[PDB]
Amino acid sequence: ATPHINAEMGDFADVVLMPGDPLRAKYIAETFLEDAREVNNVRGMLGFTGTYKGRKISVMGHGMGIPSCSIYTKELITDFGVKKIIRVGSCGAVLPHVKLRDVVIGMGACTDSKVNRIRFKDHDFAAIADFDMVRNAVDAAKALGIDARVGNLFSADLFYSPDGEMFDVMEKYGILGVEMEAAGIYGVAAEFGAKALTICTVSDHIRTHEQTTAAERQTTFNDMIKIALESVLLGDK
Amino acid sequence: ATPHINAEMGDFADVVLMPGDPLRAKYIAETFLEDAREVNNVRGMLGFTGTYKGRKISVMGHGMGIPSCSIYTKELITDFGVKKIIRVGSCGAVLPHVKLRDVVIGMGACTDSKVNRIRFKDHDFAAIADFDMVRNAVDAAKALGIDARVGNLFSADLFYSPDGEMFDVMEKYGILGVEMEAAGIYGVAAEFGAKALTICTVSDHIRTHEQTTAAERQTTFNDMIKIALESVLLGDK
Amino acid sequence: ATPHINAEMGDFADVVLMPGDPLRAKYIAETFLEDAREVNNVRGMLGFTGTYKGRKISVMGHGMGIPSCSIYTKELITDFGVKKIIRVGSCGAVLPHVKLRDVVIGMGACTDSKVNRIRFKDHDFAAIADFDMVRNAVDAAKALGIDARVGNLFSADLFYSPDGEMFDVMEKYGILGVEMEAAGIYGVAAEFGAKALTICTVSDHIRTHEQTTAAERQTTFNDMIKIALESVLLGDK
Amino acid sequence: ATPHINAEMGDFADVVLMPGDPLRAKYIAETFLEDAREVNNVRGMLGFTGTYKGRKISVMGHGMGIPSCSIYTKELITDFGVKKIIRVGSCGAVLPHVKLRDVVIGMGACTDSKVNRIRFKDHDFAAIADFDMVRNAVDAAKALGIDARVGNLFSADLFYSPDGEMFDVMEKYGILGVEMEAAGIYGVAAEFGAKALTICTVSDHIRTHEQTTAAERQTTFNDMIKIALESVLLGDK
Amino acid sequence: ATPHINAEMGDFADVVLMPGDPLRAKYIAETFLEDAREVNNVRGMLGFTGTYKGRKISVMGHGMGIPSCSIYTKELITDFGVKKIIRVGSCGAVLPHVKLRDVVIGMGACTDSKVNRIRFKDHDFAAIADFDMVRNAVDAAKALGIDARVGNLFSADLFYSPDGEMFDVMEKYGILGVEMEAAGIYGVAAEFGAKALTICTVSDHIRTHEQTTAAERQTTFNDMIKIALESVLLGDK
Amino acid sequence: ATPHINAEMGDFADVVLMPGDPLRAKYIAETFLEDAREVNNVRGMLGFTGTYKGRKISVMGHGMGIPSCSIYTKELITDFGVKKIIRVGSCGAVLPHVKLRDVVIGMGACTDSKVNRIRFKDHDFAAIADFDMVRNAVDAAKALGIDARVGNLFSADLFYSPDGEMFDVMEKYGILGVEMEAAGIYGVAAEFGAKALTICTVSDHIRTHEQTTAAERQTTFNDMIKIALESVLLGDK
Numbered sequence A, B, C, D, E, F: 001a002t003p004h005i006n007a008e009m010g011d012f013a014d015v016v017l018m019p020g021d022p023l024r025a026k027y028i029a030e031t032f033l034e035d036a037r038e039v040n041n042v043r044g045m046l047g048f049t050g051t052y053k054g055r056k057i058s059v060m061g062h063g064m065g066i067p068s069c070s071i072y073t074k075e076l077i078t079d080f081g082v083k084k085i086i087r088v089g090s091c092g093a094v095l096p097h098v099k100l101r102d103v104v105i106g107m108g109a110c111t112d113s114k115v116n117r118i119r120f121k122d123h124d125f126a127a128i129a130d131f132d133m134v135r136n137a138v139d140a141a142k143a144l145g146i147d148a149r150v151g152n153l154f155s156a157d158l159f160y161s162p163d164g165e166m167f168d169v170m171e172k173y174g175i176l177g178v179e180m181e182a183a184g185i186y187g188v189a190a191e192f193g194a195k196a197l198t199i200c201t202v203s204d205h206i207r208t209h210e211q212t213t214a215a216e217r218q219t220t221f222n223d224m225i226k227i228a229l230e231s232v233l234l235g236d237k
């Protein structure tokens, strides 16, 4: 057991999907995992382990923010033998052509945070995902007939940022989506030798100002989850 | 209802106690509040509103890290008329003379986060608590015969910091406790026009390594909650 | 004798009031101290030690700017056993509701100086005053029927700042007064193990431009000195 | 015609291969392209356009350092309609498990340069390559029986860096190779909406300097060019 | 009259020598100027105007630190028609070969301060003296048979710096002397269109740890002053 | 022989002239030096040694950007005993009173590069030329009836800077010319104990782009070389 996870080695699979919302983890466990057992509830950060098409898989919330997901992923990698982490969340759109229900894969992640600079002698550390995991995700989305956009995400420390001019910048440099963990998770993965990937569905559009709500929205969220789950299956083969 | 809180203007008191852990907010509602009523459960961030010796009070977790509490404190302040936020949590100590279970009042909060620099044109913004709130807490503590140090806290972005030596710097400058929120909450308070104070219980020494133990946790934690609740009363008078 | 103070251990009281202007230190010695004795004149930075209602007190100018007062406060603390430093000066206001002659207590001090970043590994060090000293001053002020705001000051390196807009940022974050020392004095206090507090008289509005006028200066200045001197008494009791 | 490219729109292909040394550009043109025609001589930075298996392609040296290649890549993107830039060169390794002559694909590029911060409001921009180009290169390498590693490169501003401890950091964070352009080219591509990729062959090892014959170097360099060239064909399919 | 100088246009010469110590200004006025009249005493910062070999010359203290000298030089340049400022002070040695009684001329000045970054969009502004003034100084020293070293000075914000490793750095890059104003004065000169120069005599040796005291020491200080005075005479011709 | 210079100690003179474009190096050698012998061909960066009025002198292109010239200047200083480096090239002007073909001597060089901060503990290093070399160049220019301006140059990392407002800043602070190497060469020279100078001729004007005939350009370029060459002779005297 670690400070934020009350479980023991073996309780988690070597791969863990991680949404920001713990309630979302329970939703993933019951919707896609068979024989899912809760392996953690500390601070209400629900974690589950089960199987997908016979493969052992875990899913657990990481809370909101780089500081939050950093603790959890680190504890998973160094104390529970987790070798892969796939964040599955929502991001805000900045690019006009990126429509809602578009699955976004963060090959890289820009950031507002100072954590990677702390780690990298105040230089620029390019926070990137594991290449194979990105490829597995793209191929899985393909097999499912889903159009995935691979590019840069932006991990912000302030969901309510005082600088709105930054969004024009993110747009100029092609940032595909804005969220709050990717850069943090990739920094932890590189620091402790594991692999990570972040997948997002666009729920908000800071461009055309139009969030999402319909059966269609929830269908895209599940597609993302399937992409994540199927991508690990391809990784095993 | 805001993006992370499903409640309506009026569901919250004008003062809100906030621990990091949502499960603690619940325990506080059940232990110190009468007519406890759950006003939010989005993302499992349990929020309660009740009464303490006649005063309307609210208690809701804020999650871990500056990005997490910044979201909640902001939404409470701008959409629920919350005037005062009182963070009640745990912190690690760096000063040898600061022993476990000690109660620390964060008059100020240092940080390695970039949030305030982003707000303050990259200059040094002194993240400070509201003076009256600090004084109220100091007084409530004396009335309860409890010792309470007043000074600087350090809000870290990385619980698992790769910069060990920074703790020597914290010690040299008198940091009373190491946590992960104060500086963010104080930043938001100044930005959105509210008042805040962070009270922390010394859960361990970053040096010695002695995580919370036995039933000591409850007494001290209850003392902190007692100090914060009473301080709110002295504040009204 | 230190490099900038020709005095000997014992020439100074354990508490020292310090205005920026050396000529003010003299006026204070003559006006409020009995048995006033000049203990330093190096670089014309007049220093005095006398008695106030029986208490041994010292008053010496610290010059203008963080680099200047850092030198003096440091030498007093490390070579003359000075335990408490109380800066008593003037400040420009940025908040419309803060009017001229207002008395401000710097609980905290923001700055655009790099001194604290150099001390704090380039992180954010919250330059704060000693809590008891702030409280003593707030009380001394009430006993004198004087209004005194408590909050953040901004210590600027450039009196003639080429960044006008920064004042809007100061206003937005509630800076009560703009001066040029607080943050440095608080930094030195933490570094060398002493206590400090900065009290300022609002000499004008950075906006309106209304430099000190008539005999109002003397009354208010004397009120500030009265508040600082009395605060030292409440401190001993 | 631009400040450093004396040619007209159409003279270059929509895809440009760029070696560090200009001499290599002429070699590439006469060794792998057919019907090559010179298109630029300014500053001795030779430029060539021709075909590889029917595909129109251009090659030209980009010089050493982020500033040099930023000039050329920018002009090609905005004035000659270039859509893809592939830098082909050498790099030094810091990882023991990375051998000389190993082919490294830079999915991302870290850097100690300020060009990206100046572009990104002083935040962390993750300088990444175009994902499809990365996979094309990996698949082309596989088809040619060549082993290819994908990950981070480090673009140094100083070949003779005053800091030797930084190499330990690079190793700790998995940097595959050290060179001097990638982060700059990726920044430029992002700024002007184009795609870029950097492929390097491990020339030396900052570790234990091994040894390679001019013959072995020849083979490796041609493998890198074929990879690059075949990757372009895969991209078209 | 300006906020820190109680004088009127004409009271100062268009050239002003400035030592840090106001008492030193009086020493210069009486030792080298004929018919010297005090033109300022605000805050005890003595200023004088007289003639040297028939030329109108002024001398005035600037206090200690960039923040201090910035105010004074700015007020002199923009309100008293001063076109030239020559700081004449003392500096600490860092280079072994730079002996005591060596006259140092700061063609440039490095710094710890953030003031020039505030002015220069956070970039590197090379704080330099006016070339002609440097040349006049070198020629004047020559005519007097004095060996002047021209190079870089280092303007520190902290006379008592917490980082001693910086001195090795200053030494590695050939900094000839350490003081506290040059960089500030050069920033003001460039900002308001005037010319400045800083001349120093080495009084302390942070290398061999040996200050200076003798008739010889005071002879070198006067040589520096003569150099400054004679250099302006050459400037007029 | 070094990584970028295939020559041996003695092949170069203790003084090296460096133009941006390598083609210019061959021109300088056959137009102003006698008995010239090639000493380097690596990467097409031609090197030559010979004599000018009996004085041994070398010339070789340094490429574009701080990173490029830093490599070459460092190797020449540490491996070929070079004592003086004179960069001769062009620059863009931002000051209206600075006309095309004007000769500019860089006593100092500002920059937006991080190389000097990385070298100087993140402080402001004033990248300055060797004073004697500056005066030699000014005197040589005078002797040749050429007008020469002395002051700051700005070494940009990005020829195509995203910020256009910075040019206003440069103008406000008197920058005489914009180029891309000076600050880097001065940094290197300071690091390895050598002397450097940068001389530029105003090629274009970021203001109103005027016009110059290839003939006028020829004349101006030769004037700059003579200046440089004659300045070396003056330095020897």
Ligand SMILES: Cc1ncnc2nc[nH]c12
Binding pocket: A090, A091, A092, A156, A158, A159, A160, A178, A179, A180, A204, A206
């Ligand atoms: C609109 C917005 N801004 C910042 N971070 C976000 N994550 C999701 N949506 C976001």
Ligand SMILES: Cc1ncnc2nc[nH]c12
Binding pocket: B090, B091, B092, B156, B158, B159, B160, B178, B179, B180, B203, B206
């Ligand atoms: C090491 C550390 N960092 C931040 N918050 C903490 N609480 C307890 N220990 C902590």
Ligand SMILES: Cc1ncnc2nc[nH]c12
Binding pocket: C090, C091, C092, C156, C158, C159, C160, C178, C179, C180, C203, C206
């Ligand atoms: C503009 C300004 N800056 C710093 N200190 C001051 N006191 C009065 N006005 C001031």
Ligand SMILES: Cc1ncnc2nc[nH]c12
Binding pocket: D090, D091, D092, D156, D158, D159, D160, D178, D179, D180, D204
């Ligand atoms: C140390 C270093 N820096 C930059 N590029 C390189 N290629 C090989 N070694 C290198």
Ligand SMILES: Cc1ncnc2nc[nH]c12
Binding pocket: E090, E091, E092, E156, E158, E159, E160, E178, E179, E180, E204, E206
């Ligand atoms: C020793 C020392 N350190 C820092 N600044 C100084 N000015 C003069 N002497 C000095």
Ligand SMILES: Cc1ncnc2nc[nH]c12
Binding pocket: F090, F091, F092, F156, F158, F159, F160, F178, F179, F180, F204
């Ligand atoms: C804009 C710019 N940047 C860098 N070097 C230059 N030479 C001429 N113009 C230039």
